[PDB]
Amino acid sequence: EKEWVEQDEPGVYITLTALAGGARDLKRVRFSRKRFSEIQAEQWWADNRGRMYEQYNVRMV
Amino acid sequence: GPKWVKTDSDFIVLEI
């Protein structure tokens, strides 16, 4: 399955694939080190993962 | 669960 990247917001890049004609499959989230410390990236995920779980298909384990 | 990967110098990666 071919992957592609989208910008969720500046510095935050999600890698997606097609899945079952519904939500795209989330493969990874990349945080620009120009814009994010590791602490800020972990805070971003804590703040945004709820939305991410609903907008995308996210394997939980 | 998702894992943080911190070995790249350009991006922090959360690998699902």
Numbering used by the authors:
A (entry chain A): 1006 to 1066
B (entry chain B): 272 to 287
Q: What sentences appear in the manuscript?
A:
To characterize the interaction between RLDs and LZY3, the RLD2 BRX domain and the LZY3 CCL peptide were purified and subjected to a binding assay using isothermal titration calorimetry (ITC). We found that the BRX domain and the CCL peptide form a 1:1 complex with a KD value of 9.7 nM. The RLD2 BRX domain adopts a compact α + β structure comprising an N-terminal three-stranded antiparallel β-sheet and C-terminal α1- and α2-helices. The LZY3 CCL peptide is folded into a β-hairpin structure and docks into the hydrophobic groove between the β3-strand and the α1-helix of the RLD2 BRX domain by forming an antiparallel intermolecular β–β association between the βB-strand of the CCL β-hairpin and the β3-strand of the BRX domain. The complex is also stabilized by polar interactions and the electrostatic surface potential of the BRX domain is complementary to charged residues of the CCL hairpin. Using transient expression in protoplast cells, mutations at corresponding Phe1052 and Trp1066 of the RLD1 BRX domain or at Trp275 and Leu285 of LZY3 CCL were found to prevent the recruitment of RLD1 to the PM by LZY3. Here, we have provided the first structural basis for the BRX domain as a protein–protein interaction domain that forms a 1:1 complex with LZY CCLs.
Structural analysis of the complex of CCL domain of LZY and BRX domain of RLD, which are responsible for the direct interaction of these proteins, reveals hydrophobic and electrostatic interactions at the interface of the anti-parallel intermolecular β-sheet. We also demonstrated that the CCL domain of LZY and the BRX domain of RLD form a complex with high affinity in vitro and that they are necessary and sufficient for the recruitment of RLD from the cytosol to the PM. Our results prompted us to propose a model in which LZY3 recruits RLD1 to the PM of the columella cell in a polarized manner according to the direction of gravity following amyloplast sedimentation.
